Write an enzyme that holds these catalytic residues in place. Structure first.
Site, PDB file in Angstrom:
ATOM      1  N   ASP A  44      -6.730   5.950  -4.891  1.00  0.00           N
ATOM      2  CA  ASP A  44      -6.288   4.570  -5.032  1.00  0.00           C
ATOM      3  C   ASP A  44      -6.329   4.163  -6.504  1.00  0.00           C
ATOM      4  O   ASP A  44      -6.605   4.972  -7.392  1.00  0.00           O
ATOM      5  CB  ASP A  44      -7.053   3.658  -4.074  1.00  0.00           C
ATOM      6  CG  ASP A  44      -8.491   3.398  -4.502  1.00  0.00           C
ATOM      7  OD1 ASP A  44      -8.919   3.830  -5.591  1.00  0.00           O
ATOM      8  OD2 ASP A  44      -9.207   2.733  -3.721  1.00  0.00           O
ATOM      9  N   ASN A  75      -6.759 -20.405 -10.079  1.00  0.00           N
ATOM     10  CA  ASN A  75      -8.128 -19.913  -9.962  1.00  0.00           C
ATOM     11  C   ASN A  75      -8.163 -18.465  -9.483  1.00  0.00           C
ATOM     12  O   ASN A  75      -8.973 -17.665  -9.971  1.00  0.00           O
ATOM     13  CB  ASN A  75      -8.912 -20.810  -9.010  1.00  0.00           C
ATOM     14  CG  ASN A  75     -10.385 -20.465  -8.970  1.00  0.00           C
ATOM     15  OD1 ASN A  75     -10.852 -19.785  -8.058  1.00  0.00           O
ATOM     16  ND2 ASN A  75     -11.126 -20.931  -9.964  1.00  0.00           N
ATOM     17  N   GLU A  90       0.792  -1.226   0.000  1.00  0.00           N
ATOM     18  CA  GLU A  90       0.000   0.000   0.000  1.00  0.00           C
ATOM     19  C   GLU A  90       0.826   1.278   0.000  1.00  0.00           C
ATOM     20  O   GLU A  90       0.303   2.333  -0.381  1.00  0.00           O
ATOM     21  CB  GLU A  90      -0.954   0.032   1.203  1.00  0.00           C
ATOM     22  CG  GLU A  90      -1.918  -1.143   1.266  1.00  0.00           C
ATOM     23  CD  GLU A  90      -3.010  -1.085   0.221  1.00  0.00           C
ATOM     24  OE1 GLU A  90      -3.257   0.005  -0.359  1.00  0.00           O
ATOM     25  OE2 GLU A  90      -3.632  -2.142  -0.030  1.00  0.00           O
TER      26      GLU A  90
END
Ligand SMILES: CCCCc1cccs1
Length: 163
Positions: free
Chosen positions: A20, A132, A11
């Protein structure tokens, strides 16, 4: 390494309101303020969160305190969720960090479509889970961060963060 260091890497740290990757007003170590396009709305959220009139700017101490609250909120959200908790409890400590990382980024609602990934993780089918997990808007929109998180789930090591 621990969840705080991992998310601090992913972050960054910014002491003034920023946007963001989705364009939403944020501050600190990835603290979402609002999805509203109004900067004034974001500033109100910030003042409420910090407890003073901030003018869109915080200190490092304040950013770190918000970050601790946000990590704890992600953990408690997992532990209160009947679908996420059993998978979380099945994981080792390093993979639990990857789980918290995803919930921090997307929230409980954002991970709702990961049902099949959750099953593969609980079954400890790591390579299949990694494949996945990458079939997602998450991976396509933030691929470097998703690759680090997925590598953490695949290997159970900090290799992606040391590298
Ligand atoms: C793939 C679902 C989001 C991350 C996790 C929460 C709980 C276990 S894994």
């Amino acid at each position: 390494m621990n969840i705080f260091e991992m998310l601090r890497i992913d972050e960054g740290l910014r002491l003034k309101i920023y946007k963001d990757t989705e364009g939403y007003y944020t501050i600190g170590i990835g603290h979402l303020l609002t999805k509203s396009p109004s900067l004034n709305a974001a500033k109100s959220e910030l003042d409420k969160a910090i407890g003073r009139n901030c003018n869109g700017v915080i200190t490092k101490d304040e950013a770190e305190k918000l970050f601790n609250q946000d990590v704890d909120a992600a953990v408690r959200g997992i532990l209160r969720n009947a679908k996420l908790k059993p998978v979380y409890d099945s994981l080792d400590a390093v993979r639990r960090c990857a789980a918290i990382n995803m919930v921090f980024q997307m929230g409980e609602t954002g991970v709702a479509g990961f049902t099949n990934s959750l099953r593969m993780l609980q079954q400890k089918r790591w390579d299949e889970a990694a494949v996945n997990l990458a079939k997602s808007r998450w991976y396509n929109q933030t691929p470097n961060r998703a690759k680090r998180v997925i590598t953490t789930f695949r290997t159970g090591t900090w290799d992606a963060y040391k590298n």
